[PDB]
Design a protein around this ligand. Structure first.
Ligand SMILES: [Zn+2]
Length: 500
């Protein structure tokens, strides 16, 4: 009713093996969602797969499999992948689902009846083998990417959407809403395109060419092609018309995308919503490219490709997520490598966090009889309760690297604290002081673990379990000092982050 959060990731092409780019955007959405769930927000985190089209159709035909049966099996590679990355999405939308088809046809009819749709002719480079149109850039120097054959100018009957008519409105909307497209840099690029005519939008293709897809309500001989299909998922998953979910979440829609699909989300999408009578989204959040270790765009030929799943099996899901959130500023092109991840893992996780936990546990068994000491003021460590409040705005503004840098900064402060106070020496003189010092460390770690939960859900819960703290938490608990209770700690706990 008040605190509402809705985040979406793009709907990914089904016949595409999940890669680093899909992993990053999805992990960022997961973090954003987990964080808000923790801040007491009624939240919805959506993800899904794009399954229609002729490429997908021809791939199914090759394997001698039914189209539906094909996407059904391959869409699962994404579900399995998200399972491995620990993605807690609320819904997984598939464009072949009935609920989606229903909404697409519904928005199509409404827009067609509004007179924004007309039959026309599309012209351009065409590949007879592909049965699809290409643009200059899309052509690998003259010829078709696949088939490597010459394309020829061709025309084809297509239904169009009067998108140009909406350019004036869109231009001004972005001018009136400077926060619409989060990373500022990107907001200036959209405005540049709206300065020139954007033209009309082809929204269909003959079933003769594209037999796999959603038919137009007024012309079953045609199929919805891309746009009015994939884009509507954001609204389809909410049962848009009479759905409670649509009424609750749509008003706070946060779209996460990569810069590659910026025009479709910043220009096309807003005008389709306008013509459909649907309110504009709240924010379009653009992430940059995760460049190879050589600072170049990942690629086979360059052999600079980084596989997240291989890296996940080596260091674990928690390590991977942390590295990507702490090391890559959202919106900026950043190179990634296995070396950068191993360093962060060695320093931040295995040493600063894991060792401190292992160290504190050993010291509780020795100086506190295997139990958390009696609560005491935090002194210079009490300032950590003001982190949640300083992090909230940092997170909302897509500054995840700065947020985590702050949380880990506190963890480093904890290390320095215990290394300075030296509880094993203070015990000889005053046991009460040694215990006091230890309590501040367990309570300092409790708070830290909370702040880091969205980044490493399993590991942070493991940290609390290992210190006898309450596993399930809420961000508000990280704002009050003295919550850790004096209870025994598990006699044996595995090393949080083992040596690799
Ligand atoms: Zn081709």
């Amino acid at each position: 009713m008040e605190k509402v959060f809705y985040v979406t990731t793009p709907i990914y092409y089904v016949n595409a093996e999940p890669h680093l780019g899909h992993a990053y955007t999805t992990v960022v959405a997961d973090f954003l969602a987990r964080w808000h769930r923790l801040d007491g927000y009624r939240t919805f985190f959506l993800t899904g797969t794009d399954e229609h089209g002729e490429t997908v159709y021809r791939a199914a035909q090759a394997a001698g499999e039914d189209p539906k049966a094909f996407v059904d099996r391959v869409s699962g590679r994404f579900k399995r992948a998200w399972d491995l990355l620990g993605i807690a999405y609320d819904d997984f939308i598939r464009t072949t689902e009935e609920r989606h088809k229903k909404v697409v046809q519904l928005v199509l009819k409404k827009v067609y009846e509004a007179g924004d749709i007309y039959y026309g002719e599309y012209e351009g480079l065409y590949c007879v083998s592909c049965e699809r149109f290409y643009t200059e850039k899309e052509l690998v120097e003259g010829l078709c990417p696949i088939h490597g054959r010459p394309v020829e100018r061709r025309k084809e009957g297509n239904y169009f959407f009067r998108m140009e008519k909406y350019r004036p409105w869109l231009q001004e909307y972005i001018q009136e809403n400077p926060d619409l497209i989060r990373p500022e840099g990107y907001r200036n690029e959209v405005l540049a395109m709206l300065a020139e005519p954007i033209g009309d939008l082809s929204i269909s293709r003959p079933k003769s060419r594209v037999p796999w897809g959603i038919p137009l309500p007024w012309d079953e001989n045609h199929v919805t092609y891309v746009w009015f299909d994939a884009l509507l998922n954001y609204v389809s998953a909410l049962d848009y018309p009479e759905g409670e979910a649509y009424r609750t979440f749509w008003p706070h829609a946060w779209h996460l995308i990569g810069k590659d699909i910026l025009k479709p989300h910043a220009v096309f999408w807003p005008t389709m919503l306008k013509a459909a009578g649907i309110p504009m989204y709240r924010h379009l959040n653009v992430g940059g490219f995760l460049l190879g270790p050589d600072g170049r765009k990942m690629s086979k030929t360059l052999g600079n490709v980084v596989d997240p799943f291989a890296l996940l099996e080596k260091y674990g899901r928690d390590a991977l997520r942390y590295y990507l959130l702490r090391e890559i500023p959202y919106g900026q092109d950043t190179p990634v490598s296995e070396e950068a991840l191993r360093t962060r893992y060695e320093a931040d996780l295995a040493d600063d966090l894991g060792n401190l936990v292992q160290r504190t546990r050993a010291m509780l068994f020795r100086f506190a009889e295997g139990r958390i000491p009696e609560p005491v003021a935090g002194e210079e460590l009490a300032e950590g309760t003001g982190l949640a409040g300083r992090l909230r705005p940092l997170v909302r503004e897509l500054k995840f690297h700065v947020a985590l840098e702050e949380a880990m900064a506190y963890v480093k402060a904890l290390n320095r604290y215990i290394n300075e106070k030296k509880p094993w020496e203070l015990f000889k003189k005053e046991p009460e002081e040694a215990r006091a010092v230890l309590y501040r460390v367990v309570e300092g770690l409790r708070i830290a673990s909370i702040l880091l939960t969205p980044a490493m859900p399993d590991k942070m819960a493991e940290l609390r379990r290992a210190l006898g703290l309450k596993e399930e938490v809420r961000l508000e608990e990280a704002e009050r000092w003295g919550l850790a209770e004096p209870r025994p700690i598990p006699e044996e706990a595995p090393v949080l982050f083992p040596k690799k």
